[PDB]
Amino acid sequence: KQYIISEELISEGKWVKLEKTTYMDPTGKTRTWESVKRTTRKQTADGVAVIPVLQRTLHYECIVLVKQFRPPMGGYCIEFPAGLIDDGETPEAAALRELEEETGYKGDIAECSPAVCMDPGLSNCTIHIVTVTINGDDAENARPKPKPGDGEFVEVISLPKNDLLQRLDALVAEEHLTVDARVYSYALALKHAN
Amino acid sequence: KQYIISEELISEGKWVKLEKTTYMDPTGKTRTWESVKRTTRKEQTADGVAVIPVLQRTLHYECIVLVKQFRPPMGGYCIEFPAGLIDDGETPEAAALRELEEETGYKGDIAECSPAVCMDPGLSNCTIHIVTVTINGDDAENARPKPKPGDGEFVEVISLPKNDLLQRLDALVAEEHLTVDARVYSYALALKHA
Ligand SMILES: CN1CCN(C(=O)c2ccc(F)c(F)c2)CC1
Ligand SMILES: [Cl-]
Ligand SMILES: [Mg+2]
Ligand SMILES: [Mg+2]
Ligand SMILES: [Mg+2]
Ligand SMILES: [Mg+2]
Numbered sequence: 001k002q003y004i005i006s007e008e009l010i011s012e013g014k015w016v017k018l019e020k021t022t023y024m025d026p027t028g029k030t031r032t033w034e035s036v037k038r039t040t041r042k043q044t045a046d047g048v049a050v051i052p053v054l055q056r057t058l059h060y061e062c063i064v065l066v067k068q069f070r071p072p073m074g075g076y077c078i079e080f081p082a083g084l085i086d087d088g089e090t091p092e093a094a095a096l097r098e099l100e101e102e103t104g105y106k107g108d109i110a111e112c113s114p115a116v117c118m119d120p121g122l123s124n125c126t127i128h129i130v131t132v133t134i135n136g137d138d139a140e141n142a143r144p145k146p147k148p149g150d151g152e153f154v155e156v157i158s159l160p161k162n163d164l165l166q167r168l169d170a171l172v173a174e175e176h177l178t179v180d181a182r183v184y185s186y187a188l189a190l191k192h193a194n
Numbered sequence: 195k196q197y198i199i200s201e202e203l204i205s206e207g208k209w210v211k212l213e214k215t216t217y218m219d220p221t222g223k224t225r226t227w228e229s230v231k232r233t234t235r236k237e238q239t240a241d242g243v244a245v246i247p248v249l250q251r252t253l254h255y256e257c258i259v260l261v262k263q264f265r266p267p268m269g270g271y272c273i274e275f276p277a278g279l280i281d282d283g284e285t286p287e288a289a290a291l292r293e294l295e296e297e298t299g300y301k302g303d304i305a306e307c308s309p310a311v312c313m314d315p316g317l318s319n320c321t322i323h324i325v326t327v328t329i330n331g332d333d334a335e336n337a338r339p340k341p342k343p344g345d346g347e348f349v350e351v352i353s354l355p356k357n358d359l360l361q362r363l364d365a366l367v368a369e370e371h372l373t374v375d376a377r378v379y380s381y382a383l384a385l386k387h388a
Contacts, residue, residue, distance in 0.1 A: 002264035002271075002348070011205035011212055013228045016317065018205055018212055021266040026348050033266035034207045036230050036317070049376075051383070069196035070315035071215040071227035076196075077315045113383070114367055116376040118314045120265035120272040122210065122230070125314060129379055131387075153196070153220045161387075172309050181244075181311040184324055185377040188246065188308075189384030192326070194256070194356070 001026035007035075015039055036123040040084055045115040047127040048094045049082040049182060052107055053161065056136035060160040064134065065183060066102050067155040078157065078171065079180040082127070095130035102154045104144030107132035129182070165191045195220035201229070209233055230318040236282045240310040240321035243290045244277040244377060247302060249353055251331035257353040259329065260378065261297050264348065271372040273352060273363065277322070290325035297349045299339025302327035324377070360386050 003024055010018040021033045038046050052064040070077045081102040085094040092109050099107050110131040118125040134141060148154060159167045165187035168179050199216040215227040235241050247259040265272045278293035280286060287304050294302050305326040313320040329336055343349055354362045360382035363374050 004266065004269045010207055013204060013212065013214075015228045016212060016230060018207060018210060018230075020207070023264070023266045025346055026264075031346055034210045035267035036210060036212075037267075038317070053387075069217070069220075070312070071198065071217045072229035072231070072317060072319045073312055073315045074198045074319070077312055079315065082316075113374075113379050115373065116379045117265070117268055117272055117373045118376055119318070119320060120268045120274065120373070120375065121277075122232075122267060122320060123314065123317065124267045124269070125317060126373065127376060129376065129383065131383065151219060151225060169309075178310065178312045178315065178321070180315065181313055181322060181324065182376050182380040184308055184311045185246075185380040186384040188324065188326065189381040190388050192246075192248075192356075192381075193385050193388030 005030065010034070012039065036125075038123075038125060042087060043085050044091055045085065045126040045128050047082055047084050047118075047125070048091050048098060048130050049080040049127050050095045050099045050107075051080055051129060051131045051186065052099055052103065052105060052134055053110070053132065054105070054134045054136045054158055059136070060162060062158040063161050063164055063186075064103055064105065065157045065159065067157055067177065068153065073178055075176070075178060077178045077180060078168065078183060080183055085128075091128035091130060095128070095132060099132060101147050101149065102152070103156050104146040105134045106138075106140050106144075107134040161190065199224060204228070206233065230320075232320060234279060238280045238282065238284075239286060240280065240323050242277060242279045242320075242322045243286050243293060244275040244322050244324050245290045245294045245302070246275055246324060246326040246381070247294055247298070247300065247329055248305070248326065248356070249300070249329045249331050254331065255355045255357050258356050258359055258381075259294075259298055259300065260352045260354065262350040262352055262372065268373060271370075272375055273366065273372060273378060274375040275378060280323075286323035286325060290323070290327060294327060296342045296344065297347070298351050299336075299341050300329045301333070301335050302329045356385060
C-alpha cells in the first residue's frame with residue numbers, strides 16, 4: 001500500500017543529509033516526512049555492532065562494551081563495539097576488525113543478523129548485529145592491544161552477562177553515562193528470559 | 195576529559211535539525227562532528243518511549259507484541275516495539291501505556307522503566323525510555339483489542355512467542371521485504387543467548 005514518491009534534499013553535510021520525503025499513505029493521501037541519511041553507504045548496511053562474549057574458564061562469561069564521548073549526545077555512552085563497514089568489507093570482517101580496533105580482542109564469528117534499523121522514524125541507518133565469542137584464555141587475548149584509528153578514544157568495560165542489566169543500571173547511577181538502547185534491550189531480555 | 199565547545203545550527207526543519215558540533219578531544223585538540231537532533235524535545239527526560247509488551251495469557255506461551263509500519267526514512271516496512279514520542283508533561287510510563295494502547299489496542303500494566311537510553315549516539319542525541327509492560331490477556335479489556343491509530347498512523351500488530359522470537363522474526367524477514375528493528379533483534383538475540 002505505502003511507498004516513496006520522491007525525496008527533497010533539505011541539507012547535505014560531509015557525513016549526514018536531511019531530506020523531506022514525500023510518500024503515499026495507504027488511503028491514497030500524499031504526506032511528508034523529514035528523514036536523515038548518512039552520506040557514506042554503497043553495502044549491506046551502514047554499520048556493524050558487535051556483541052562480544054568474553055569466555056574465560058572458571059570466570060563468569062562477560063559481555064565486552066565500550067565507553068566513548070559521543071558529540072551528538074554531549075556526553076559519554078556505553079555501547080557495543082561498532083563502526084561503519086568499509087567499501088568491499090563483509091559485515092563479519094568489519095565486526096572482527098572493529099572489535100580488535102576498539103577492544104584489542106580477537107574473536108570468532110558466531111552469527112550475523114540481517115540489516116536491522118537503528119531509528120526508523122528518523123533515519124535509514126542500519127547495521128548488522130554480529131555475535132562474536134572471544135576465547136579469553138588464548139594467548140592472543142591475554143593483554144589485548146586496542147588499535148584506535150584517528151580521533152577514536154575508547155574505554156573498554158567488560159560486564160558479567162548473568163547480571164548485565166543490574167551492572168549497567170549501577171554504572172548509570174554512579175557515573176552519569178548513557179547506555180545504548182540495543183545494549184539495554186539485550187540486557188533486559190537476558191533478565192526476561194524464562 | 196571531553197566536552198562540547200559549541201553547537202552551530204546547519205539546518206532546522208519542522209521536526210529535525212542538523213548541527214555542527216565542536217568539541218574538545220582528550221589530547222586537547224578541538225574537533226567537530228555533524229549531529230542530528232529533534233526539534234520536539236522540551237523538559238521530557240527523553241524524546242520517546244518504546245514498549246516491551248509481554249502478553250500473558252493462561253495456558254498460552256508469553257508473547258512479545260510488535261508492530262509493523264511503513265517508515266518513510268527507511269522506504270519500507272519495519273517491525274518494531276510499539277513506540278512514540280512523549281507529550282510535554284507526560285511521564286515516560288504514561289506515554290508507554292498510551293502509545294501501546296493507541297498502536298495495538300492493548301491495556302497494559304507497568305513493570306519497569308529504564309533510564310533514558312541513546313538511539314544512535316554517533317549520529318543523534320535521540321533518547322528513549324524503554325518501558326516493559328505486562329498485558330493481562332485474560333482480562334476482558336484485552337479480548338478484542340482495537341487500535342486507535344492517530345492521523346496518518348497505520349499500524350499492524352504482530353504477536354510472537356517469546357520462546358521462539360528470533361526464529362519467528364527470521365521467518366517473517368525470509369518471506370517479505372521488511373526490516374527488523376535493532377532493539378527488537380537485540381532483545382530476540384539475548385532471549386536465545388540466555
Ligand atoms: C505530525 N505529522 C507531521 C509529519 N511527520 C514528520 O515529518 C516527522 C516528525 C518527527 C520526526 F522526527 C520525523 F523524522 C518526521 C510526523 C507526522
Ligand atoms: Cl554466544
Ligand atoms: Mg565505533
Ligand atoms: Mg572502530
Ligand atoms: Mg509509534
Ligand atoms: Mg503513536
